[PDB]
Structure 1
Amino acid sequence: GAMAPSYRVKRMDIAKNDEECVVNAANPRGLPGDGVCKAVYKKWPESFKNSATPVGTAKTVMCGTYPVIHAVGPNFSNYTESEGDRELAAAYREVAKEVTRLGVNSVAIPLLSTGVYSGGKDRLTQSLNHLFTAMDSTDADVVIYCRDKEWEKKISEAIQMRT
């Protein structure tokens, strides 16, 4: 574990992370995708061998010895608010299981279902609170990656609020 497990937030490409493993905002079919998923495909393409997994699950594939945890959040275009909320919570619970299983001291994680799977809504708070619910019982250092300047400030505030 980390000596003093922490949450941090950085505004940059998750493909440049300084953590011991990465969470991909994957599609269910293991396709290259767009946004975070495309960046992960360019950096760790070997990790897309047999990475297809259902919505609400996570599947880890090694790139060398570097673990890529493919986490499939729901696309809110297809799910009801109720069913999507349940699947988004479930995906993060499966990320916490994998992070624990791998024995890593640190993990880089994006906010699932906040980009092209958001169904055109702002889901920062919804997605971050499900991240915290899953990861709070883990002892890895968690580093959340985002690209928007206003989101960085809001994620940083939410972390500092609970310290």
Structure 2
Amino acid sequence: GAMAPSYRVKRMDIAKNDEECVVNAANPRGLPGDGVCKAVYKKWPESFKNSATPVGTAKTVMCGTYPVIHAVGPNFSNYTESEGDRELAAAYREVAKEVTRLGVNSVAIPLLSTGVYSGGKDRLTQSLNHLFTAMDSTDADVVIYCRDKEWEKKISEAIQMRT
């Protein structure tokens, strides 16, 4: 575990992370995809061997010894708000199980279902709160990666609020 487990946020490409493993915002079919998923495919293509997994689950595949945790958030275009909310919470719970199983001291994580799977809605708070629910009981240093300047400020505020 980390000596003083923390949350941090950085506004940069998660493919350039300084953590011991990465969470991919994957699609269920293990396809190269768009956004975070395409950056992850370019950086760690070997990790897409048998990475297909259902919505609401996470499947880890090693790129060398570097773990890529493929976490499949729901696409809110297809799911009801209710069912999507349940699957998004479940995906993060499976990420926490994988991070724990791997014994890493740090993890790089995007906000699941906030980009092309958001169904055109702002889900910063929904996705971040489900991240916290899952990861709060883990002792890994969590580093959240985002691309928008205003999102960085809002995520930083939410982290600092809890102290």
- When normalised by structure 2's length, the TM-score is 1.00
Structure 1 vs Structure 2 CA RMSD: 0.1
Number of residue pairs matched by the alignment: 163
- The alpha-carbon deviation at position 30 of structure 1 amounts to 0.1
Matched residue, 1:7: 7
After TM superposition, the score normalised by the length of structure 1 is 1.00
Equivalent residue, structure 2, for 1:74: 74
- Taking the aligned partners of 1:150 and 1:44, their CA distance within structure 2 comes to 28
Which segments of 5 or more consecutive residues in structure 2 lack a partner in the other structure? none
| Partner Cα separation in structure 2 for residue 121 and residue 31 of structure 1 | 24
Counterpart-to-counterpart distance in 2, 1:144 and 1:108: 6
Where do 5+ consecutive residues of structure 1 fail to align? none
Q: Distance in 2 between matches of 1:112 and 1:81?
A: 15
Query: How far apart are 1:147 and its partner, in Å?
Result: 0.1
Partners in 2 of 1:34 and 1:74 — Cα distance? 15
Alignment deviations for residues 2-54 of structure 1 (CA, whole Å, 9 cap, x no partner)? 00000000000000000000000000000000000000000000000000000
Shift of 1:111: 0.0
Q: Distance in 2 between matches of 1:115 and 1:18?
A: 23
**Matches of 1:84 and 1:50, distance apart in 2:** 24
Using the TM superposition, give the Cα deviation of residue 159 of structure 1 relative to its aligned residue in structure 2, in angstroms.
0.1
Deviation of the 1:101 alpha carbon = 0.1
Q: Which secondary structure does the structure 2 equivalent of 1:84 belong to?
A: helix
Q: Deviations along 1:52-103, whole A, 9 cap, x unmatched?
A: 0000000000000000000000000000000000000000000000000000
- TM-superposed CA distance for 1:150, in Å, is 0.2
User: In the alignment, which residue of structure 2 is the partner of 1:103?
Assistant: 103
Runs of 4+ in 1 over 6 A off after TM superposition: none
Tell me how far apart the structure 2 counterparts of residues 53 and 134 of structure 1 sit (CA, whole Å): 19
Q: Could you tell me how far 1:161 is from its partner in structure 2?
A: 0.1
SS in 2 for 1:92: helix
Aligned to 2:37, what secondary structure does the other structure show?
Answer: helix
